[PDB]
Design a protein around this nucleic acid. Structure first.
Ligand code: NA
Ligand SMILES: [Zn+2]
Ligand SMILES: [Zn+2]
Ligand SMILES: [Zn+2]
Ligand SMILES: [Zn+2]
Lengths: 70, 67
DNA sequence: CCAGGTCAGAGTGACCTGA
DNA sequence: TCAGGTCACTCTGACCTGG
């Protein structure tokens, strides 16, 4: 377990996955996306923060891409 | 026949004091047995988008009078 | 060490069941 | 009629294994 944080949601990172530090959740979520159509119910600017229980599927995927997952 | 006052899907009956669909019925059922909005507490709740933000779906349930 | 797979855990909603 | 239960379906993510 690395002393690093997930660049997507701020949870503890499990490792360096798809080119970014990420948790198992965000790793699998991105994994499943490369194999989807999400719609943000708000304005495409949702906070992704695991500790505060904030997430949005569309904005989660956009943030995965934003921070550099490939 | 009436529409669900929470999401606009077809209503199945009068549940918890509100005309509503089986989805919103069950969702409120589970809530009364905690949700945070990642946006601005104004997320769209409709038959397409209702599953997306739990916090706003519950607030919409309360707004239209589910008890 | 990580990519990709696995499947128990959890939310959904159409349908069930008793008051 | 409705309140509350059911459970197949599906997404989630903790853990595994091979590389
Ligand atoms: Na997914
Ligand atoms: Zn994460
Ligand atoms: Zn969003
Ligand atoms: Zn509804
Ligand atoms: Zn919301």
């Amino acid at each position: 377990k690395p002393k690093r944080l997930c660049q997507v949601c701020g949870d503890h990172a499990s490792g360096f996955h798809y080119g970014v530090w990420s948790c198992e959740g965000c790793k699998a979520f991105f994994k499943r996306s490369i194999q989807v159509d999400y719609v943000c119910p708000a304005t495409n600017n949702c906070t992704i923060d695991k500790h505060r229980r904030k997430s949005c599927q569309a904005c989660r995927l956009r943030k995965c891409l934003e921070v550099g997952m490939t």
